[PDB]
Ligand binder design. Sequence first.
Ligand SMILES: *[C@@H]1O[C@H](CO)[C@@H](O[C@@H]2O[C@H](CO)[C@@H](O[C@H]3O[C@H](CO)[C@@H](O)[C@H](O)[C@@H]3O)[C@H](O)[C@H]2NC(C)=O)[C@H](O)[C@H]1NC(C)=O
Ligand SMILES: *[C@@H]1O[C@H](CO)[C@@H](O[C@@H]2O[C@H](CO)[C@@H](O[C@H]3O[C@H](CO)[C@@H](O)[C@H](O)[C@@H]3O)[C@H](O)[C@H]2NC(C)=O)[C@H](O)[C@H]1NC(C)=O
Ligand SMILES: *[C@@H]1O[C@H](CO)[C@@H](O)[C@H](O)[C@H]1NC(C)=O
Ligand SMILES: *[C@@H]1O[C@H](CO)[C@@H](O)[C@H](O)[C@H]1NC(C)=O
Ligand SMILES: *[C@@H]1O[C@H](CO)[C@@H](O)[C@H](O)[C@H]1NC(C)=O
Lengths: 48, 46, 46
Amino acid sequence: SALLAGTITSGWTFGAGAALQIPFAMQMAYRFNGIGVTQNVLYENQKL
Amino acid sequence: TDNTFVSGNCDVVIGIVNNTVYDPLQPELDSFKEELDKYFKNHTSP
Amino acid sequence: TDNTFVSGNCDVVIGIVNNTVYDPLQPELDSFKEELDKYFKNHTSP
Ligand SMILES: *[C@@H]1O[C@H](CO)[C@@H](O[C@@H]2O[C@H](CO)[C@@H](O[C@H]3O[C@H](CO)[C@@H](O)[C@H](O)[C@@H]3O)[C@H](O)[C@H]2NC(C)=O)[C@H](O)[C@H]1NC(C)=O
Ligand SMILES: *[C@@H]1O[C@H](CO)[C@@H](O[C@@H]2O[C@H](CO)[C@@H](O[C@H]3O[C@H](CO)[C@@H](O)[C@H](O)[C@@H]3O)[C@H](O)[C@H]2NC(C)=O)[C@H](O)[C@H]1NC(C)=O
Ligand SMILES: *[C@@H]1O[C@H](CO)[C@@H](O)[C@H](O)[C@H]1NC(C)=O
Ligand SMILES: *[C@@H]1O[C@H](CO)[C@@H](O)[C@H](O)[C@H]1NC(C)=O
Ligand SMILES: *[C@@H]1O[C@H](CO)[C@@H](O)[C@H](O)[C@H]1NC(C)=O
């Protein structure tokens, strides 16, 4: 629960130190940006 | 605009807000407009 | 400027050095100023 709750609310940031909150949709944008599909492509399809 | 890319229009992005985006080309050209218009003015003189 | 970004004045970076940094926008506005001058100069002759 703590690993999962930490993840859905703070992304990777609790894995480095204190948790830093981030809006999920945006976070997923950083993810998409990490696999190189530029972050707009998430927000342009967030519902899908 | 040197920090930012563009894609699509202000209907699709959930939670998008309103804010100016500054373009450093613009006042680099606006100082070129006032440099220009003062040469228009002095050329009317002679 | 297309190759480089900026932060702060030079008082902070130990071992920093001085060199002229080229702006590839500038001679494109200088050439457009010499083109502009020509229009200003010709507009005197009629
Ligand atoms: C963010 O800034 C936008 C641009 O100023 C703004 O959009 C404008 O919103 C108003 C109100 O919805 C629209 O007003 C018109 O609405 C209808 C036509 O669609 C007419 O019946 C009205 O008489 C009136 O003319 C503007 O046309 C609209 N402009 C654009 C370009 O979208 C947003 O509302 C702003 N949002 C926030 C959160 O501040
Ligand atoms: C790179 O450029 C720097 C700025 O053009 C330059 O720093 C300047 O160096 C001069 C000469 O040492 C200083 O001249 C003044 O020095 C003291 C005050 O600091 C006064 O007593 C003197 O009378 C004289 O006015 C400038 O003050 C100094 N400018 C700054 C902002 O620190 C560097 O030396 C240059 N470096 C190289 C490698 O070219
Ligand atoms: C305008 O042009 C004349 C030359 O025709 C020059 O003497 C004068 O200094 C110029 N003044 C300005 C404000 O550019
Ligand atoms: C680099 O080392 C030399 C001594 O070999 C010294 O004079 C110089 O000031 C040093 N440069 C910096 C930026 O510390
Ligand atoms: C000068 O301006 C006139 C229009 O007024 C144009 O026909 C002519 O080609 C121009 N000449 C030069 C060298 O700019």
